[PDB]
Amino acid sequence: SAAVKEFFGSSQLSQFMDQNNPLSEITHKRRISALGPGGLTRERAGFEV
Amino acid sequence: EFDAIKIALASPDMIRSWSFGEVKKPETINYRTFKPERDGLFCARIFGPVKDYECLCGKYKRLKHRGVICEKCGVEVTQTKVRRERMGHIELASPTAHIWFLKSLPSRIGLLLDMPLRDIERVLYFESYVVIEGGMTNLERQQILTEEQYLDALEEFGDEFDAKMGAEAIQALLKSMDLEQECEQLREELNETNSETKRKKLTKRIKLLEAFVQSGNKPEWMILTVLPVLPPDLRPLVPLDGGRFATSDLNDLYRRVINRNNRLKRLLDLAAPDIIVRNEKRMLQEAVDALLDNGRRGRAITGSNKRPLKSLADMIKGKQGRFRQNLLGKRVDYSGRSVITVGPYLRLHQCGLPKKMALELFKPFIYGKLELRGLATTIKAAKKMVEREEAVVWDILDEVIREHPVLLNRAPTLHRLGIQAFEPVLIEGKAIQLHPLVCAAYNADFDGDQMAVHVPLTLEAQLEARALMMSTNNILSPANGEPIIVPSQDVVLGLYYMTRDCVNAKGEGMVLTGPKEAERLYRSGLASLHARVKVRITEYEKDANGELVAKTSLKDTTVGRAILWMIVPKGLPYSIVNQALGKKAISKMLNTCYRILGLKPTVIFADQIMYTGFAYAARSGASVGIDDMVIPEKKHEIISEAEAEVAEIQEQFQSGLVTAGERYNKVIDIWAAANDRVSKAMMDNLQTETVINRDGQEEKQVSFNSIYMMADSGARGSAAQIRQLAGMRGLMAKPDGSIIETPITANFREGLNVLQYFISTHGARKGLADTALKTANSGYLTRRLVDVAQDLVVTEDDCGTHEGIMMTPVIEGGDVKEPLRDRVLGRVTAEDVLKPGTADILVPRNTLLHEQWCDLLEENSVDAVKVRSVVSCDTDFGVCAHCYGRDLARGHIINKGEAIGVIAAQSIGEPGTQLTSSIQVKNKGSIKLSNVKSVVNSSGKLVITSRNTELKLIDEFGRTKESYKVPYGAVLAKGDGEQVAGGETVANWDPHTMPVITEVSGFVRFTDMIDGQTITRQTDELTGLSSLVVLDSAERTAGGKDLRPALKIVDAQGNDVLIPGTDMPAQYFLPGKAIVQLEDGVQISSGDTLARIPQGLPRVADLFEARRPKEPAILAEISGIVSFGKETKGKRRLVITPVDGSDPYEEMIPKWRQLNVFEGERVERGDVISDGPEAPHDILRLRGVHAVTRYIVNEVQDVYRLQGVKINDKHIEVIVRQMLRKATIVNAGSSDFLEGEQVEYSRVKIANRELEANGKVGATYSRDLLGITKASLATESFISAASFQETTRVLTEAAVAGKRDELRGLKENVIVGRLIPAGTGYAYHQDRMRRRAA
Amino acid sequence: TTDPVRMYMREMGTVELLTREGEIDIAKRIEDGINQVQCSVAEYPEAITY
Amino acid sequence: HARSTGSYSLVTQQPLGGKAQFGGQRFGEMEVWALEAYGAAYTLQEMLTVKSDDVNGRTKMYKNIVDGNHQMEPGMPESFNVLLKEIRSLGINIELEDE
Amino acid sequence: IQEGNIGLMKAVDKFEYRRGYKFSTYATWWIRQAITRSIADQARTIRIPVHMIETINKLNRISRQMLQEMGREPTPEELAERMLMPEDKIRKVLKIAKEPISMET
Amino acid sequence: ARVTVQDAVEKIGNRFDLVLVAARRARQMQVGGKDPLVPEENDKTTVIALREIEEGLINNQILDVRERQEQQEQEAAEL
Amino acid sequence: RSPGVFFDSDKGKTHSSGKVLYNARIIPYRGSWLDFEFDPKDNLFVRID
RNA sequence: CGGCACAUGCGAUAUUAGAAUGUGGCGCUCCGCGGUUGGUGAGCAUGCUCGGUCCGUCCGAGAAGCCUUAAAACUGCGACGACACAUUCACCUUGAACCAAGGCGUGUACCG
Ligand SMILES: [Mg+2]
Ligand SMILES: [Zn+2]
Ligand SMILES: [Zn+2]
């Protein structure tokens, strides 16, 4: 429970829903991020990505 | 209060002198009640009381005592701010190496003992031994051992032997060393012996030693014995809301250090075995080294967290250290922030400001006025009155605003117009209204950007913000004399609609008595706004001495021009409003009004221009629509023709006739040709499309299309974007940087299908990513440029020197890129310049050149002017005002005091966002050839034997219209001085063929040319003339490998042909692929070929950094006859033979690469020996300081003028000055310095002028250019060298040296929080400098 | 590499394990040591009378 | 928002930035270069000593303002004193000198 | 391991072989005692005492056991009847056992 | 009102001594040691000081003469 | 990046010789990586990390 | 000319499996009780006397009693807190954990 609550509670991939518009919900659920654990960071990468 | 800041090492006696307690126990606070624990890291008797004037027990609670200490529990009852101030100490049991003197790259214990760092860490981690002055039996001093070798040395030598291990050993090494004995030793080693790179390291070490002894330091202080601790309110443990605390991680670090120190004392009490105490001493070393600077070990992380903790050097060094987060820039009270908006009803000395922000900012002012006027009896009543916002406070607030300037600020404050003052007008609203003409200075659009207001509290700051920073003072840029309050977009559209003419309108060709009935005709609707009309206007002029001579006439003009004429002030002529008035024209209008009538009519004239521009733009109704973008009827026809032509090239590639690359190049050339035809179709379909009639058939004119006015006025966009809206848009490039053969044949008025838009998306996203990254790099470039140049302040009124550089126009290959006039305008002359009739003084020797003087320059025929430059000034510690120039927000000469390094570096780095054959003569004149040496051949032409020839197209007025770098060995048609015509190719060289031309005429022969080895026998299929041609290095045999083929000349008699004029024959050595066409005993003429040899912003941050180029141009050291030495080492020995001096110089050249000079020629010092880029070091070291500053300014002005951004050259010159402050002395002489020592040029200059004024001999120097990230840290003031760059190396380099900082130059004075010795504080520092030590 | 835990392991890795009788032998050396210090006390009369 | 005088940060006596913590528009490094670029020097002296950092100077300024006497008693910034205690709490001796 | 080595040296001080046990069985209790006493002593910013840390470890052990018995998490009202403490002290024991946040978190 | 400070720059040069002179004068008018030598239009002491500069009757030299005159009157008023 | 095997080039930039290198890489989903790469003089090399 | 190693810069400003037991002494605990020196915001808007009066109220000067002193401090008697030492039982048995891998630069040391 500590690991799964640590993931859903604190990660770069798990964030507050932008909820001020139906479009904003439906495009925050449809988002393809390349950041987070197991992915590149803004400092290190990069131009081709 | 105090003077210069001193820094040094800390003795353990000094550390016990600082500290007011020994922290013996690792507790922080008691857990149950949160009183601090005695005597932990947070103590009472060590640091101070918790509450204001109260003991911890409670025996002393009030101001009845302040000197007493409680004898129940020690508390010195004082203020609790004392707890912010007093420091502690820790008695470390075993000693400990200081990590800053151990692990920084120029390691101080490393090259103080002359011992490699891995052996030192091997000693400090108890892996080995080291002898500590162990006599002379078998073992040397620095000779390390191992454990088995230690047993060997102990069983072989029981006594008179000393070798410890660990920090005790390094401390005994540093304590045992006698410094001045080794000083004598290294002086003897630098006198007799010479081991060049090693003795350079050796003289660096002796520099460190005699710098160390000159200080007051001892070496064993580099090992910590007693470690100081920081006060508690700097590492606070304070309650959050909720019973949970925030500790700083320094509490963890000091807790770990105190814990392991207590453990080591406890182990040495119990007499532990050696493995355990060596473990504990390594652990205490790790704990201390993690406290001082965590991150130079295995990065000891904190508890209940994976994140690495924050040590002391983490709190000094970096983006979040005290140098850059809390000293150089502070968060400030009396500030506000809100969204900005336009409000065009303002004069530009005033901005809008909300009532609620004005009430919140000016609260203490309102409090003061209310308790003065007696409406509030006390000040708490004033608080409640301004809290309830009663109706009486708004008159009070209008009294406190009236003449009180506020400071407006946008967050990217690049150049100095980002902070400007205004006078507030109160606004019903919540948005700052910001004057429109000012916004182009801010780079502020109103798309949601928000600005910040600051309030000058004190009286001097009000007078500063009015006298220096009011918006009406800054109407000229500091980058150039151009106006920065240029009317931007709506106003120029209102003008361009107002001053124009259509061939038929109401009131066509009627007569008007003046501008007043022009306005009565337009505003009644009888006559149109624009119709050509004779009016009577009265223009004034400054013909006499500041006198307004009036002349009146009937000008043939339009109605709208006459309506605008009421707004022009008295002084200007009428021709400033008689044209169409785009953006360039209105900038010239404001520039002439400022350069004639001064400041006040230009300010009120800019306000009246803005008002009338917005008003008649409203009356214009200039509106974009969908019919406003006319598509050419010739569009799809040209696209169909190009679609047939690509099918032609497609059939020619399927027929195997062409390859792929020539196909690709032909297709991209025909699509670019189609795009150019579409552009020339759409421009002629827009601009002249309006065709109407007056008293006749028809007549064409410029169009009243909306988008053509918005592109021709220069309001927004140019013809590239109009092209992308109407004609086809360009040729897009794929992520390769390759460019697609199928361009986008659709504009935005037509639709784009999916594939075209998908291709365009890549260019858009690459553009956005590049704008972000270039923003970041431009910020870094601005920061380095200001931090290399804050020390420079205009300090003296005049030095009175004869130095200077030579301003010439910068024409190169094409037409004029920047003329003589707008280069020299604003500078000052060094010597007097003369007419082309000599001995005619046109200016005297040093006068400030203004616009009438440049008029006097242009009415004559002057071409080159000697100018005083700041890089060749004479002044100590600054630049004298009479040498700098004039360019500023004002127009006069620079005042004594004002900082120009900062404005220079800002004006350079501010446009960093915006950054990215034969002779075909164009113009006509006379021909001139400089540094030419040529000979007439048999064919009537002229072949050139000197490659320094510069071709100048001199007209009848002496000036240069074209210049051509003449290649070596060209074929001139005309000679020199003959009047040449346009288009005439005079010199026609072969650019693919390096000439082996001569001066001789006779029989070409072979010398040292052996067949099959140096030369092969080729029999030609095309021409048929079989010959013996020189081969490569792989095929030439071991005999003729070093033996080179040579060509030499005889006459008919067999005697060697000498050059006519000298005695040397022409024996020339050919490389590989040098084709011998003419064989043994074959006659030539004068200069025939003996053979033929066939085949952005980081640029600026490379120039000012002055990085070494990848392929350097090689340059001759001293002038002399060039010759060759030994062959085939990979290099060759380039030997110089001066006539008068001593010759024996030779330089290694990698002989694979193509050279320039032949062996028979002679070179000057600083002349090129090959081509390519050259280092600035070579240009400075050979030619001169004037040449290297000319090289930098011409290269970086090419980089800026490619984008078309004007920067005056003073700024680049003063950055060049701040580059080359350091200079190594060659000959010491009567001075104190050394043969390789690097000291700043101003310090050796004041030393010589004391000695050269005496009869003694001076010290000759070698000027040395350094880059901006290295000339800024090599500084005699270490806070300016520690505020931005690598901090740890600077503090340790200035801590071993005992260096003293005299606050010297605006970085330290921003740091230490006193006045600045540039601006208004210059008079204060001058009064203090007169007072100090006099 | 520095990693001073590993330097501790390599500094103690040279010391080898004990057999089950060598511990008794070391304990008998400890007995001999305390025997000799108590016999050194046994000659000193002032400690006795104290 | 705007701020006359609110709270101050603990470790360095500066007004902490934010909203609605009353903040303060951070007069950062480039704006200090901008005021150096003018002749403004009293503005900068009050901009980074009295309005921001000095623990005595801000209260002296508030008294002088509510008395209607525009005048600053500058003193020394507090965060520079923190920098001295941080370098001094290394092995590095740094001092201020005589007159 | 250094606190364990201090405990081991205390074990070698108080070792008696004539009982017949191996050195391991006797020395393990001294090493664990020194290590547990050290963790209770010096591993916290606010130094909380030995019996207080015993109470905290009892709370974590019993709340580990009850969490798989009940299922949700135990409320301290269940810890009233589960243990022998009057449930108002259990709140302050739960409060004291919190490590302080790093001020650079 | 005072939109541009140009006339005061023409009277007192150097553009930086102007600030110090006007500051000293406006302190002489705010702290009540003196009173203005020009009619005030409900301006603050800043603008009144700059207007006294533009009328020519204040610079650094005249202020120094007036300050030494006040010191001499103090020396005469010691009694 | 998909777990699998990637054959990248990393052209040019090593030691400015003009030669291209080649590096193969086995990227797992959970575990240690694997690399194979050449050098400027035609020698193959392994990396477990 | 290669390799290994290390250092250093940039990567925008701004806004957001322990368990149990005993004994000992201690108190920088503000927790009940006793003794000791030792006060203050009450009568007093004149309790009293005298003088001025604009007054029967306010100003100016005096003396006394009753009543507020465990407040402040000191020292002992209870509670609590922390600390030390000692004992009994049970278990445990000889070399750990750890992250992260995609950018652009500058430089130093060592070896071949
Ligand atoms: Mg914007
Ligand atoms: Zn006390
Ligand atoms: Zn000069």
How many of the other CB atoms lie within 10 Å of CB of B744? 20
User: What is the token pair recorded at B1210?
Assistant: 């003073």
Cis upstream peptide for A46 (omega within 30°): yes
E21 touches chain C (CB under 8 A): no
How many of the other CB atoms lie within 10 Å of CB of B562? 26
- Protein B73 CA to nucleic acid H25 C1', in Å? 22
State the pairing for strand pair B950-954/B925-930: antiparallel
The answer to whether B282 and B125 have CB atoms below 8 angstroms apart is yes
Q: Is B607 annotated as a binding residue?
A: no
- Protein B914 CA to nucleic acid H82 C1', in Å? 71
**Burial class of residue B524 in the structure, from the number of CB atoms within 10 Å of its CB (0-12 exposed, 13-18 middle, 19+ buried):** exposed
Question: Distance, CA F5 to ligand 1 centroid (Å)?
Answer: 33
Q: How far apart are CA B785 and CA B900, in angstroms?
A: 12
Residue type, B778: S
| Token pair 């081709």 in the structure block, residue | A48
Three-class SS state of B951: strand
Chain H: positions less than 7 Å from a protein CB are 1-3, 6-20, 28-30, 73-74, 81-83, 90-97, 100-104, 106-110
Q: How far apart are CA G40 and CA B1218, in angstroms?
A: 42
A–D contact: 3+ Cβ pairs < 8 A: no
User: What is the token pair recorded at B446?
Assistant: 């109103």
Vertex B414: Cα angle to B408 and B416 (nearest 5)? 60
**Residues flanking ion ligand 3, Cβ below 5 Å:** B 799, 873, 880, 883
D–F contact: 3+ Cβ pairs < 8 A: yes
Q: How far apart are CA B484 and CA B420, in angstroms?
A: 13
The dihedral over CA atoms of B1031, B1033, B1036, B1040, expressed in degrees to the nearest 10, equals 110
- The enclosing H or E element of E28 equals helix E23-42
Question: Distance, CA B878 to ligand 3 centroid (Å)?
Answer: 9
Q: Which of E9, E43, E102 sits opposite B249 (nearest CB)?
A: E102
Answer whether any strand H atom is within 7 A of the Cβ of B32: yes
Three-class SS state of F70: helix
DSSP E strands in B1054-1130: the ranges are: 1068-1069, 1082-1083, 1092-1093, 1120-1124
The CATH code belonging to domain E48-105 is 1.10.10.10
Q: Which of F2, F15, F46 sits opposite B459 (nearest CB)?
A: F46
CA atoms within 13 A on the CB side of B947: 21
Q: Report chain E residues whose CB lies below 8 A from the CB of B266.
A: 6
DSSP-assigned letters across all residues of B207-272: HHHHHHTTTT--GGGGEEEEEEE--GGGS-EEE-TTS-EEE-HHHHHHHHHHHHHHHHHHHHHTT-
- Protein E52 CA to nucleic acid H35 C1', in Å? 39
User: What is the token pair recorded at B1099?
Assistant: 């640029």
The whole-angstrom distance between residue B1056's C-alpha and the CA centroid of its chain comes to: 59
Question: Distance, CA B422 to ligand 1 centroid (Å)?
Answer: 22
User: What is the token pair recorded at B4?
Assistant: 């210069």
* D window 7-26: Cβ near strand H (< 7 A): 17-19, 23, 25-26
**Burial class of residue B355 in the structure, from the number of CB atoms within 10 Å of its CB (0-12 exposed, 13-18 middle, 19+ buried):** middle
**Burial class of residue B738 in the structure, from the number of CB atoms within 10 Å of its CB (0-12 exposed, 13-18 middle, 19+ buried):** exposed
- Protein B1179 CA to nucleic acid H43 C1', in Å? 103
Residue B29 bridge partners (DSSP)? B36
State the pairing for strand pair B163-164/D2-3: unpaired
Ligand whose nearest atom lies closest to the CA of B795? 3
Answer whether any strand H atom is within 7 A of the Cβ of B38: yes
Domain of F33, CATH number, reads 3.90.940.10
Residue B807 bridge partners (DSSP)? B865
Q: How far apart are CA B1113 and CA E66, in angstroms?
A: 81
Listed resolution, Å: 3.8
Question: Which structural domain, as residue segments, surrounds residue F50?
Answer: 1-79
DSSP-assigned letters across all residues of B587-619: HHHHHHHHHHH-SHHHHHHHHHHHHHHHHHHHH
> Which of B1014, B1077, B1018, B999 lies closest to B1046 in space, CA to CA?
B1014
Ligand whose nearest atom lies closest to the CA of B443? 1
Q: How far apart are CA B189 and CA B1142, in angstroms?
A: 28
Q: Which of F15, F16, F30 sits opposite D70 (nearest CB)?
A: F30
| Token pair 């009472």 in the structure block, residue | B44
Longest dimension (CA), chain D: 47
Alpha helices in B860-969 (DSSP H): 881-884, 901-909
Q: F3, F21, F24: which to substitute to probe chain B, counting the most B Cβ within 10 Å?
A: F3
DSSP-assigned letters across all residues of B971-1036: EESS-SS-EE-TT---B---TTSEE---S--SEE--BS--BTTTEEEE--SSS---EEEE--TTTS
B464 touches chain F (CB under 8 A): yes
B30 touches chain E (CB under 8 A): yes
Determine if residue B977 is left, alpha or beta; phi over 0 gives left, psi from -120 to 50 gives alpha, anything else beta. Answer: left
| Token pair 């060997």 in the structure block, residue | B152
Q: Is B1042 annotated as a binding residue?
A: no
Collect all residues with Cβ–Cβ distance below 8 Å to B538 and sequence separation of at least 6: B550, B551, B552
- The enclosing H or E element of B1049 equals strand B1049-1050
Indicate the number of domains in chain F: 1
D68 touches chain F (CB under 8 A): yes
> Which of B825, B812, B871, B873 lies closest to B1188 in space, CA to CA?
B871
